[PDB]
Design an enzyme around this catalytic site. Sequence first.
Site, PDB file in Angstrom:
ATOM      1  N   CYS B 109       7.368  -1.161   3.379  1.00 18.48           N
ATOM      2  CA  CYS B 109       7.999   0.078   3.826  1.00 18.48           C
ATOM      3  C   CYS B 109       9.505  -0.037   4.122  1.00 18.48           C
ATOM      4  CB  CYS B 109       7.206   0.673   4.991  1.00 18.48           C
ATOM      5  SG  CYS B 109       7.987   2.032   5.814  1.00 18.48           S
ATOM      6  N   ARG B 112      11.256   1.657   7.885  1.00 16.11           N
ATOM      7  CA  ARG B 112      10.924   1.099   9.198  1.00 16.11           C
ATOM      8  C   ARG B 112      11.948   1.208  10.303  1.00 16.11           C
ATOM      9  NH1 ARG B 112       8.708  -4.619   7.702  1.00 16.11           N
ATOM     10  NH2 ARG B 112       9.599  -4.396   5.584  1.00 16.11           N
ATOM     11  N   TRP B 281       8.176  11.103   5.819  1.00 14.26           N
ATOM     12  CA  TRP B 281       8.854  11.957   4.874  1.00 14.26           C
ATOM     13  C   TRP B 281       9.122  11.101   3.648  1.00 14.26           C
ATOM     14  CZ3 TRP B 281      11.126  11.460   9.881  1.00 14.26           C
ATOM     15  CH2 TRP B 281      12.200  10.570   9.971  1.00 14.26           C
ATOM     16  N   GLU B 286      10.645   8.468  -4.978  1.00 16.59           N
ATOM     17  CA  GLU B 286       9.217   8.464  -5.056  1.00 16.59           C
ATOM     18  C   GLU B 286       8.791   9.702  -5.895  1.00 16.59           C
ATOM     19  OE1 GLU B 286       6.941   7.415  -1.361  1.00 16.59           O
ATOM     20  OE2 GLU B 286       8.834   8.087  -0.432  1.00 16.59           O
TER      21      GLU B 286
HETATM   22  C1  HEM Z   1       9.770   8.205   8.116  1.00 17.16           C
HETATM   23  C2  HEM Z   1       9.968   7.985   6.826  1.00 17.16           C
HETATM   24  C3  HEM Z   1       9.333   6.960   5.974  1.00 17.16           C
HETATM   25  C4  HEM Z   1       9.819   6.659   4.750  1.00 17.16           C
HETATM   26  C5  HEM Z   1      11.035   7.338   4.163  1.00 17.16           C
HETATM   27  C6  HEM Z   1       9.008   5.661   4.214  1.00 17.16           C
HETATM   28  C7  HEM Z   1       9.221   5.126   2.960  1.00 17.16           C
HETATM   29  C8  HEM Z   1       8.306   4.323   2.319  1.00 17.16           C
HETATM   30  C9  HEM Z   1       8.298   4.073   0.930  1.00 17.16           C
HETATM   31  C10 HEM Z   1       9.275   4.672  -0.032  1.00 17.16           C
HETATM   32  C11 HEM Z   1       7.275   3.302   0.641  1.00 17.16           C
HETATM   33  C12 HEM Z   1       6.838   2.785  -0.715  1.00 17.16           C
HETATM   34  C13 HEM Z   1       5.759   3.816  -1.219  1.00 17.16           C
HETATM   35  C14 HEM Z   1       5.381   3.692  -2.680  1.00 17.16           C
HETATM   36  O1  HEM Z   1       6.219   3.261  -3.505  1.00 17.16           O
HETATM   37  O2  HEM Z   1       4.208   3.952  -3.086  1.00 17.16           O
HETATM   38  C15 HEM Z   1       6.617   3.066   1.882  1.00 17.16           C
HETATM   39  C16 HEM Z   1       5.546   2.206   1.990  1.00 17.16           C
HETATM   40  C17 HEM Z   1       4.861   2.192   3.209  1.00 17.16           C
HETATM   41  N1  HEM Z   1       5.201   2.809   4.393  1.00 17.16           N
HETATM   42 FE1  HEM Z   1       6.641   3.923   4.775  1.00 17.16          FE
HETATM   43  N2  HEM Z   1       8.132   5.214   5.142  1.00 17.16           N
HETATM   44  C18 HEM Z   1       8.171   6.069   6.170  1.00 17.16           C
HETATM   45  C19 HEM Z   1       7.360   6.109   7.301  1.00 17.16           C
HETATM   46  C20 HEM Z   1       6.183   5.398   7.393  1.00 17.16           C
HETATM   47  C21 HEM Z   1       5.227   5.573   8.412  1.00 17.16           C
HETATM   48  C22 HEM Z   1       5.230   6.613   9.504  1.00 17.16           C
HETATM   49  C23 HEM Z   1       4.246   4.675   8.166  1.00 17.16           C
HETATM   50  C24 HEM Z   1       3.012   4.449   8.928  1.00 17.16           C
HETATM   51  C25 HEM Z   1       2.844   4.916  10.140  1.00 17.16           C
HETATM   52  C26 HEM Z   1       4.631   3.960   7.006  1.00 17.16           C
HETATM   53  C27 HEM Z   1       3.877   2.971   6.452  1.00 17.16           C
HETATM   54  C28 HEM Z   1       4.117   2.550   5.168  1.00 17.16           C
HETATM   55  C29 HEM Z   1       3.186   1.647   4.539  1.00 17.16           C
HETATM   56  C30 HEM Z   1       1.884   1.056   5.069  1.00 17.16           C
HETATM   57  C31 HEM Z   1       3.635   1.423   3.306  1.00 17.16           C
HETATM   58  C32 HEM Z   1       2.930   0.510   2.256  1.00 17.16           C
HETATM   59  C33 HEM Z   1       1.906   1.151   1.277  1.00 17.16           C
HETATM   60  C34 HEM Z   1       1.280   0.156   0.295  1.00 17.16           C
HETATM   61  O3  HEM Z   1       1.447  -1.096   0.429  1.00 17.16           O
HETATM   62  O4  HEM Z   1       0.530   0.596  -0.628  1.00 17.16           O
HETATM   63  N3  HEM Z   1       5.849   4.361   6.613  1.00 17.16           N
HETATM   64  N4  HEM Z   1       7.339   3.593   2.940  1.00 17.16           N
HETATM   65  C1  LIG Z   2       2.218   6.443  -4.756  1.00 16.49           C
HETATM   66  C2  LIG Z   2       1.192   5.526  -4.096  1.00 16.49           C
HETATM   67  N1  LIG Z   2       1.596   4.859  -2.800  1.00 16.49           N
HETATM   68  C3  LIG Z   2       0.635   3.735  -2.675  1.00 16.49           C
HETATM   69  C4  LIG Z   2       0.812   2.696  -3.800  1.00 16.49           C
HETATM   70  C5  LIG Z   2      -0.483   2.204  -4.438  1.00 16.49           C
HETATM   71  C6  LIG Z   2      -1.136   1.124  -3.856  1.00 16.49           C
HETATM   72  C7  LIG Z   2      -2.320   0.602  -4.361  1.00 16.49           C
HETATM   73  C8  LIG Z   2      -2.884   1.154  -5.490  1.00 16.49           C
HETATM   74  C9  LIG Z   2      -2.239   2.230  -6.100  1.00 16.49           C
HETATM   75  F1  LIG Z   2      -2.796   2.768  -7.202  1.00 16.49           F
HETATM   76  C10 LIG Z   2      -1.039   2.758  -5.589  1.00 16.49           C
HETATM   77  C11 LIG Z   2       1.536   5.854  -1.682  1.00 16.49           C
HETATM   78  C12 LIG Z   2       2.472   5.757  -0.502  1.00 16.49           C
HETATM   79  C13 LIG Z   2       2.174   4.831   0.518  1.00 16.49           C
HETATM   80  C14 LIG Z   2       2.986   4.690   1.609  1.00 16.49           C
HETATM   81  C15 LIG Z   2       4.135   5.463   1.750  1.00 16.49           C
HETATM   82  C16 LIG Z   2       4.443   6.393   0.725  1.00 16.49           C
HETATM   83  N2  LIG Z   2       5.480   7.244   0.855  1.00 16.49           N
HETATM   84  C17 LIG Z   2       5.923   7.823   1.953  1.00 16.49           C
HETATM   85  N3  LIG Z   2       7.145   8.265   1.994  1.00 16.49           N
HETATM   86  C18 LIG Z   2       5.093   7.916   3.146  1.00 16.49           C
HETATM   87  C19 LIG Z   2       3.730   8.127   3.161  1.00 16.49           C
HETATM   88  C20 LIG Z   2       3.363   8.143   4.494  1.00 16.49           C
HETATM   89  C21 LIG Z   2       4.389   7.943   5.427  1.00 16.49           C
HETATM   90  S1  LIG Z   2       5.893   7.729   4.697  1.00 16.49           S
HETATM   91  C22 LIG Z   2       3.593   6.506  -0.383  1.00 16.49           C
END
Ligand code: HEM
Ligand SMILES: CCN(CCc1cccc(F)c1)Cc1cccc(NC(=N)c2cccs2)c1
Lengths: 405, 405
Positions: B109, B112, B281, B286
């Site tokens: 993420c 953070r 958000w 994305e």
């Molecule tokens: C406030 C604005 C936030 C932004 C702009 C943001 C942005 C992102 C982005 C761009 C990703 C990569 C997503 C993707 O490519 O599929 C991500 C991953 C992640 N973010 Fe955030 N984040 C935010 C808040 C949060 C919050 C509130 C949480 C949890 C409470 C969070 C937990 C995660 C987690 C767990 C991932 C990893 C997902 C994975 O490994 O599949 N983030 N974040």
């Molecule tokens: C597009 C898919 N993303 C998960 C990636 C994934 C992971 C494992 C298998 C998959 F097929 C795809 C979703 C994701 C996860 C966490 C954050 C975000 N984007 C956001 N901006 C937020 C989502 C929730 C809080 S911030 C998107």
Amino acid sequence: GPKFPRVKNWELGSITYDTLCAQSQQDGPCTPRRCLGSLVLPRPAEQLLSQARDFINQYYSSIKRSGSQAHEERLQEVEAEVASTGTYHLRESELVFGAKQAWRNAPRCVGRIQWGKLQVFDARDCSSAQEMFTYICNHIKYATNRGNLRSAITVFPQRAPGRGDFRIWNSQLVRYAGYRQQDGSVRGDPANVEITELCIQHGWTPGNGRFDVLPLLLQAPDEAPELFVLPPELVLEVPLEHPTLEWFAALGLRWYALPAVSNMLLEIGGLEFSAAPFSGWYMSTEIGTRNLCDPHRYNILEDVAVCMDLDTRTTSSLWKDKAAVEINLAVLHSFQLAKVTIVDHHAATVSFMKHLDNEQKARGGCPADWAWIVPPISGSLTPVFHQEMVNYILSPAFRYQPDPW
Amino acid sequence: KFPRVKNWELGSITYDTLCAQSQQDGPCTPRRCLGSLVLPRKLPAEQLLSQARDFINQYYSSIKRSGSQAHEERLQEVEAEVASTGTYHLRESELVFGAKQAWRNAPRCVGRIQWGKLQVFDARDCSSAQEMFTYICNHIKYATNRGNLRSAITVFPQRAPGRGDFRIWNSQLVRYAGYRQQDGSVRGDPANVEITELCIQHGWTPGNGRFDVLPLLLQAPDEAPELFVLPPELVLEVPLEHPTLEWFAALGLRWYALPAVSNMLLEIGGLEFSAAPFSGWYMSTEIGTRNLCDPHRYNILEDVAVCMDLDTRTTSSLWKDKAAVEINLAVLHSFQLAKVTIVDHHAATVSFMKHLDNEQKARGGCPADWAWIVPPISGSLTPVFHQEMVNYILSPAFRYQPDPW
Ligand code: HEM
Ligand SMILES: CCN(CCc1cccc(F)c1)Cc1cccc(NC(=N)c2cccs2)c1
Ligand code: HEM
Ligand SMILES: CCN(CCc1cccc(F)c1)Cc1cccc(NC(=N)c2cccs2)c1
Ligand SMILES: C[C@H](O)[C@H](O)[C@H]1CNc2nc(N)[nH]c(=O)c2N1
Ligand SMILES: C[C@H](O)[C@H](O)[C@H]1CNc2nc(N)[nH]c(=O)c2N1
Ligand SMILES: [Zn+2]
């Protein structure tokens, strides 16, 4: 499934298993507790003989005479020779195979589809800095080939027990000077400030432009390096212009045609070739994105953006992204016009995908460093972004080595 | 050894000591790095007890009261409950702390810097899919906030040994339908074909557009899932237009405002929350790059490029790059015009650099996954590209879990 890493392509949904990584005998920097794949540099008699044997075994499979009499007679000469001397020497055909295999093995190289087409100049008879220079000039001439570039490597004598090394001190055969100014900024390429200053300590008379070609500093064993100026007519350069932004030509930007890396070590069968410069051609992003736009390089993004009349006071205009695109286009357009080989990042990545498939069939895998293979603009627009990759060290290989000074 | 972490743009070095706190192996070994893998390969009282005490210790340390009556008494309570029942429960203030820490610790993420600002809704007194829906509606409404988006998480009841999990079958609370054609193609989001079909089969009446919002399939322990259609007024959407290319709006494109992930397991102190949807958000790439331009997603590059009259016959025109940029620009503009929170990749990566620095001071390191942090366009144009990063698993954590069907 199988007990080998499972590798997925998320665009296509296809799966492979890397069985080649089994053959790695050299550790990378990652552990189960932590991944260090993003670090740039992560920090013998029986030992030589065993690398030697493995290498000879690889050679004999590549010509398919594995278990043969010729194979077992070669193994025996190698031990004999190490027995009595501490080292051994490669047949010419062994050096050619090993040099191509080092390229094939390089995880960071996206141009590996070409790995089988490498001209290997054998310069293991070289005995002076002067002669290194002639060999290097010949290399540059052959490789440059008036713009129709040809991959090549020139291999100088191997490291030898208790004699000094052959080294080229420059990191590439062609580099632009970087001159530290009174105001702390740099004119030219800030990457080359240390080499620039070394050249001056060694008697070079420095210029004062942005694109001054450096002299080579060549070291033969147990001597001080000597300074050699490259005949300007051997260093082909490309002035940069844009296909529709007519002012771009006015910026006076240029790049050299031939990328030729000169400070890596080529390791084959435990033998160490400390001077072994190699060249191919550029992928356009190396010039147009990293060299021209890194903030610690020429750093031209804002100047170009201002010429394009973009709003540089806010990130959300995407001014950086728009400028970088156009600078990349200028690079491709200018090389094209000049008839100098270049490959764009889409065509490079597509052909690396084809490489991956070819190697899956030939060897059961391909070591690849995803962070270096994915280009520095437009990442997910390339098919490599969507491809999982397993990174590992096989030998023969190109290695970093410390600086001679 | 502790890793050294270099920034290649500024030349600065840090050492990560936080990685010593990892109790949890990743995919890598010394023989091979598997850092580019998306998903893990795999996917008693003593061990729960130790994750428990560790987490209890993190919590008291965080409010300063490390070694107080309160702290020792709380350890005893946890010990008493585990010893007797095999499990335990968190106090609401612990859950809040633990959810923020799990976000803090997520190496993928980029957002953070916001980690301390998280609304935590405790929904552990939820006994039916009916009630999960109500809590979910309240989460959407809170977090949407008429476009002034607020990060939030809703935590449903933990897994329990005797029984099935609470689960939200959808991967996000807002997803667009993907309808497979009898001839292979897809209408809508091909990422969502499978959940789309599950919905129809549990009796959803499907639409036939490109941007139909899916119902939720919510599941209480050991029951079939139930279908809940979200009220259209709760789902804020943004029509996409371009600030200067007037035909862009004609493409009919749109995206939802609220990214809310709903299939990850939240782990705190050994306890597992199989349904804990969270939202924040969007970063504009994305939508703009991945969701709209991935070849296996909505795949609109060609169509934009055509409308822009670009030359599509040849990669070396950089048509893909130019269309991607405009599309990302449309997202940013349309979100700004609609007054809906979004952040561009430049501003986001700058904030993350700051975060890296706050975390270095606060904890001695920051787990981060370089391939996920560096955006999918203009990589090297952002500061994170030039920053070495160390990836590892701390707990509390968000993990993947199997699909419930
Ligand atoms: C406030 C604005 C936030 C932004 C702009 C943001 C942005 C992102 C982005 C761009 C990703 C990569 C997503 C993707 O490519 O599929 C991500 C991953 C992640 N973010 Fe955030 N984040 C935010 C808040 C949060 C919050 C509130 C949480 C949890 C409470 C969070 C937990 C995660 C987690 C767990 C991932 C990893 C997902 C994975 O490994 O599949 N983030 N974040
Ligand atoms: C597009 C898919 N993303 C998960 C990636 C994934 C992971 C494992 C298998 C998959 F097929 C795809 C979703 C994701 C996860 C966490 C954050 C975000 N984007 C956001 N901006 C937020 C989502 C929730 C809080 S911030 C998107
Ligand atoms: C034929 C055209 C070729 C192209 C387009 C090409 C492309 C590239 C590129 C883009 C990189 C990344 C460089 C960077 O970001 O600094 C690279 C790395 C590398 N390539 Fe090539 N390559 C080619 C031929 C060669 C040849 C002929 C060799 C050796 C015989 C070679 C060996 C390497 C090695 C060793 C690296 C890694 C350097 C490092 O780790 O620092 N490649 N290749
Ligand atoms: C800009 C420097 N590149 C390596 C980056 C590096 C690595 C370690 C430390 C550094 F300071 C810098 C050099 C490099 C290496 C290999 C290939 C290329 N580019 C090419 N297209 C080729 C060069 C030789 C054959 S193809 C450049
Ligand atoms: C920290 C990071 O590893 C570093 O900046 C890398 C990323 N990827 C790269 N990729 C290539 N091809 N060349 C590079 O110099 C780098 N730099
Ligand atoms: C194989 C590769 O790891 C995969 O395509 C990753 C790369 N980087 C990513 N980065 C983000 N932020 N989201 C992604 O899905 C991915 N996908
Ligand atoms: Zn790794």
